[PDB]
Amino acid sequence: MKAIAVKRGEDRPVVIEKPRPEPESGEALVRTLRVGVDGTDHEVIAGGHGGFPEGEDHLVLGHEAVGVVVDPNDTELEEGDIVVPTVRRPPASGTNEYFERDQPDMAPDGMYFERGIVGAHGYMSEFFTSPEKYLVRIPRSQAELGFLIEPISITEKALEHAYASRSAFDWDPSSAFVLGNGSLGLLTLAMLKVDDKGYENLYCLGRRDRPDPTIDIIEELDATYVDSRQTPVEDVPDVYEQMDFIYEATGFPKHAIQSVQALAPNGVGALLGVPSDWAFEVDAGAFHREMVLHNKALVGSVNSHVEHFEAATVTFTKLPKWFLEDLVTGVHPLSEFEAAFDDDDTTIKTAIEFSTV
Amino acid sequence: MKAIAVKRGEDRPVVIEKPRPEPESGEALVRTLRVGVDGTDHEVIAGGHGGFPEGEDHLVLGHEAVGVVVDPNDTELEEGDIVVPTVRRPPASGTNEYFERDQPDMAPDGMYFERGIVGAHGYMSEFFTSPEKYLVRIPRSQAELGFLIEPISITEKALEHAYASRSAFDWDPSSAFVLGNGSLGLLTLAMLKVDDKGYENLYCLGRRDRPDPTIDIIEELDATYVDSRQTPVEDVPDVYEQMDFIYEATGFPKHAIQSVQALAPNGVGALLGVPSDWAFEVDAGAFHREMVLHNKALVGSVNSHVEHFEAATVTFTKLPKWFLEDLVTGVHPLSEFEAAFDDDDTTIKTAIEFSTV
Ligand SMILES: NC(=O)c1ccc[n+]([C@@H]2O[C@H](COP(=O)([O-])OP(=O)(O)OC[C@H]3O[C@@H](n4cnc5c(N)ncnc54)[C@H](OP(=O)(O)O)[C@@H]3O)[C@@H](O)[C@H]2O)c1
Ligand SMILES: NC(=O)c1ccc[n+]([C@@H]2O[C@H](COP(=O)([O-])OP(=O)(O)OC[C@H]3O[C@@H](n4cnc5c(N)ncnc54)[C@H](OP(=O)(O)O)[C@@H]3O)[C@@H](O)[C@H]2O)c1
Ligand SMILES: O=C1O[C@H](CO)[C@@H](O)[C@H](O)[C@H]1O
Ligand SMILES: O=C1O[C@H](CO)[C@@H](O)[C@H](O)[C@H]1O
Ligand SMILES: [Zn+2]
Ligand SMILES: [Zn+2]
Numbered sequence: 001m002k003a004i005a006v007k008r009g010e011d012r013p014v015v016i017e018k019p020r021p022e023p024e025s026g027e028a029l030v031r032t033l034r035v036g037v038d039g040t041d042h043e044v045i046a047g048g049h050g051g052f053p054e055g056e057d058h059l060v061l062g063h064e065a066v067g068v069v070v071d072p073n074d075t076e077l078e079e080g081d082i083v084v085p086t087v088r089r090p091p092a093s094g095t096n097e098y099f100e101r102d103q104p105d106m107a108p109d110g111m112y113f114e115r116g117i118v119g120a121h122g123y124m125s126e127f128f129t130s131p132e133k134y135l136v137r138i139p140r141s142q143a144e145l146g147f148l149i150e151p152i153s154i155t156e157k158a159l160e161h162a163y164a165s166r167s168a169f170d171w172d173p174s175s176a177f178v179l180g181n182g183s184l185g186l187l188t189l190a191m192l193k194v195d196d197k198g199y200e201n202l203y204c205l206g207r208r209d210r211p212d213p214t215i216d217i218i219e220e221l222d223a224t225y226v227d228s229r230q231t232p233v234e235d236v237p238d239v240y241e242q243m244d245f246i247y248e249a250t251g252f253p254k255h256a257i258q259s260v261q262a263l264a265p266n267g268v269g270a271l272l273g274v275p276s277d278w279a280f281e282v283d284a285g286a287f288h289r290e291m292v293l294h295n296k297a298l299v300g301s302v303n304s305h306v307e308h309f310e311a312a313t314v315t316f317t318k319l320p321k322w323f324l325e326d327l328v329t330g331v332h333p334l335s336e337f338e339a340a341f342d343d344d345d346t347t348i349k350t351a352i353e354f355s356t357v
Numbered sequence: 358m359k360a361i362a363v364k365r366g367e368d369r370p371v372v373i374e375k376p377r378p379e380p381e382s383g384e385a386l387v388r389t390l391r392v393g394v395d396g397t398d399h400e401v402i403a404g405g406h407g408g409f410p411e412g413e414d415h416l417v418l419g420h421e422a423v424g425v426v427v428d429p430n431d432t433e434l435e436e437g438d439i440v441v442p443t444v445r446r447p448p449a450s451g452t453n454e455y456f457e458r459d460q461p462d463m464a465p466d467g468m469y470f471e472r473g474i475v476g477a478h479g480y481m482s483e484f485f486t487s488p489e490k491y492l493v494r495i496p497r498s499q500a501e502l503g504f505l506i507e508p509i510s511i512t513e514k515a516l517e518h519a520y521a522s523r524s525a526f527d528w529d530p531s532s533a534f535v536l537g538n539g540s541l542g543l544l545t546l547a548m549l550k551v552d553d554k555g556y557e558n559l560y561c562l563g564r565r566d567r568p569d570p571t572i573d574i575i576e577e578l579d580a581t582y583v584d585s586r587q588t589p590v591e592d593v594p595d596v597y598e599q600m601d602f603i604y605e606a607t608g609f610p611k612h613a614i615q616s617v618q619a620l621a622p623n624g625v626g627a628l629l630g631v632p633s634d635w636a637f638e639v640d641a642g643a644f645h646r647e648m649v650l651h652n653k654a655l656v657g658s659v660n661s662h663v664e665h666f667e668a669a670t671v672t673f674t675k676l677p678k679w680f681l682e683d684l685v686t687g688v689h690p691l692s693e694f695e696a697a698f699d700d701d702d703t704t705i706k707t708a709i710e711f712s713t714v
Contacts, residue, residue, distance in 0.1 A: 101527055103526050103527060105652075106526050106622075106623050106652055108622035108623075108651055109622075109650070109651070160525045161522070161525050161652070161654075164521060164522060164523075164524045164525040165518070165521060165522035165654060165656060166521075167521045167524065168517045168518050168521040169460050169463050170458055170460060253641035253642045253644065253645040254641060256641060256644060256645040256648065257639070257641055257644070265463075265465035265466075266463050266465075271645065271648050271649050272649060273645065273649060274646070274649060274650070275641075275642045275645040275646050275649075276642055277640070277642040277643070278640070278641050278642035278645075279638055279639065279640050279641065279642070280638065280639065280641055281636055281637065281638050281639075282614070282636065282637065282638075282639045282641065283634070283635070283636050284610035284611060284613060284614055284632075284635050284636065284637055284639065285610045285632045285633055285634040285635035285636070286634070287610065287613060287614070288610040288613040288628065288630065288632040288635075289631070289632050290657075291613065291628050291655065291656075291657030292628050292629060292630060292631060292632075292657040292658065292659055293466070293631070293657070293659055294465055294466070294657070294659075295462075295463055295518070295657055295658060295659060296656075296657050297518075297522060297654065297655065297656045297657070298648065298654065298655045299522060299648075299653075299654045300647075300648030300649040300650070300651070300652055300653050300654070301649065301652060302649055302650055302651075302652060
């Protein structure tokens with residue numbers, strides 16, 4: 001079968017050939033439909049994040065996948081079920097408490113593999129296998145855009161933890177600020193528009209000149225575009241307002257620290273970005289005083305698990321159809337797979353199509 | 358009546374005389390028994406925190422008080438009840454949503470007064486009045502050390518919020534690290550020893566040379582003393598272990614940032630210190646990456662409300678008697694009030710006695 005992989009030393013994704021896998025007991029065989037591409041995949045290709053499987057020359061990419069079950073084997077899945085795989089799997093040493101208690105998303109470094117990212121091959125192959133417990137059934141009609149379920153689930157987890165941090169008092173937020181106009185940030189902005197917390201004012205930070213299709217999406221959602229070149233995060237409360245909820249999706253470390261200054265009293269910032277090393281001079285006193293005297297919280301979040309994927313299927317149905325059309329700028333057949341890794345300003349979310357239902 | 362106050366421009370606390378107050382409707386008249394002194398009071402005397410009441414030449418100090426009801430007026434309190442007042446009161450402009458919903462501890466700057474700290478006189482007077490709703494009845498036998506209920510309540514709130522931040526997954530901590538060996542830090546260390554979360558290993562950071570009575574208390578609680586001059590917070594995991602829970606009570610901004618490096622995966626730091634301005638070069642990338650990839654949280658907390666004071670009465674009963682004897686290094690009659698504001702290494706928690714039951 002064909003797969004899309006990065007090879008050690010090499011700079012770009014290439015096609016390789018591998019044998020079709022066979023499911024072991026408790027696993028199903030899945031025929032890949034579509035696999036999404038995101039910022040993390042680019043960071044994996046560049047060497048900034050993740051790592052190869054032990055004793056392998058390559059890493060099959062892709063962690064945002066939707067497929068169809070072709071052989072249920074000895075599982076309770078049915079032939080033709082549409083499934084989305086979770087990303088984390090137990091490491092070489094075997095299972096551990098995080099997997100046994102069904103919270104692998106909380107496992108630390110070295111206690112997991114992430115398919116397509118660290119220590120295990122991803123889903124950009126014609127077929128793959130997975131254990132039934134890591135395959136989430138989704139409604140058949142979400143098959144075409146089912147690669148969005150994984151990134152949606154990322155935000156479902158982040159919101160669960162951020163909101164939990166505010167659960168000891170009566171918190172009623174009205175403003176939300178998304179940092180970053182990538183596919184994760186834009187998806188999250190749309191999710192916040194339909195969130196039960198009832199946000200009245202939405203804002204999204206980027207650094208693009210008009211005309212730009214990410215700006216168009218932000219404004220079409222009735223949100224305000226904030227240009228960080230004009231208004232840095234720390235200055236936002238002077239120009240606009242203090243933000244009850246901040247979701248960071250830039251991977252820029254300055255935003256992790258400065259977000260505290262933009263938060264309203266009793267607010268929380270959720271941090272999702274995978275940053276590079278970076279040192280600078282911080283007013284630590286300002287950071288410290290704001291956190292304490294205004295009862296603020298910062299919560300980091302990575303990965304997601306089954307319940308978050310399930311929640312994502314509900315959120316998906318609430319998203320405007322125009323938004324999903326505008327977000328997904330290209331779905332490319334395997335024959336043109338290279339196009340999916342192009343990253344210019346007009347490329348928002350891409351995917352590679354391996355097969356159709 | 359006599360009161361202990363700081364006067365504008367002046368450097369030290371002095372005795373002043375004021376008329377005995379009269380309770381309005383819904384208020385009781387309380388005869389002050391004992392009022393504690395803490396780090397915040399010293400910061401108020403120095404001008405680093407708080408502020409005077411509008412149109413007043415002075416501020417009566419003291420926010421940690423226990424008293425006896427002498428006139429219940431038209432309240433449901435009874436003559437002779439032992440009470441501890443809460444600290445926050447509505448500002449000049451009147452009540453607001455935070456007070457109406459019974460969460461004044463969440464009110465931002467300008468939406469509260471704090472008696473003895475900002476905008477309103479404290480409790481270092483022979484008598485004071487308060488609304489019934491802000492007077493917490495405590496068991497009569499806690500009268501002698503009842504000024505500890507307020508600082509205990511501070512930690513009760515901080516723990517509620519920190520633990521709430523971890524409530525979306527199965528968190529079972531085993532290690533806790535208290536930063537600071539002041540009266541708040543030491544009290545909190547003892548509370549953690551009896552906490553239901555079941556901490557096995559306790560640690561407390563200070564910067565004293567032996568012999569020192571704060572070191573003695575830490576070791577007598579079966580905790581490990583960490584000297585920050587030898588082992589800074591960021592290096593603690595190399596020398597000792599990663600900490601599931603960190604409670605910051607130094608007011609040193611470096612600790613607010615560095616605590617993230619000392620946290621175990623999925624851990625939370627609670628920040629309580631009231632810091633001074635301070636800038637330095639931070640590895641922001643390290644901060645950001647740890648928060649995200651290891652699902653960490655930081656929560657700030659200030660003040661406390663009735664439910665926290667109630668909880669404190671239960672915690673009080675669990676604290677070892679030897680510990681309370683060692684923590685309270687002097688209770689001074691009003692005649693020797695100056696002694697209570699002495700701050701040398703051997704002074705831990707002090708109080709001023711105005712009267713006895
Ligand atoms: N925590 C998790 O489990 C998890 C899951 C998914 C993704 N992530 C991380 O989340 C981040 C976003 O993911 P993504 O797929 O949306 O990445 P992306 O497509 O690269 O989006 C990042 C966006 O941030 C913008 N940006 C960067 N610095 C900025 C600045 N200083 N001011 C304003 N905008 C700035 C970029 O704008 P320009 O294009 O103009 O440079 C870009 O559009 C990445 O770091 C990714 O690794 C984490
Ligand atoms: N959030 C709230 O509602 C609230 C409530 C109460 C108190 N607080 C704050 O909490 C903090 C502690 O209160 P407290 O009454 O316990 O104050 P404190 O008596 O002044 O105790 C602070 C302790 O921290 C130690 N310390 C300072 N810097 C250090 C460093 N770099 N390394 C190791 N130890 C260091 C000091 O040691 P040395 O004596 O050796 O200098 C001192 O013993 C203060 O900032 C106070 O304002 C906040
Ligand atoms: O993009 C991602 O990066 C994360 C870190 O590799 C991983 O945990 C998530 O499953 C994935 O969505
Ligand atoms: O020491 C304190 O400082 C806090 C800030 O002034 C105040 O809110 C608390 O009630 C008090 O315990
Ligand atoms: Zn992704
Ligand atoms: Zn106090």
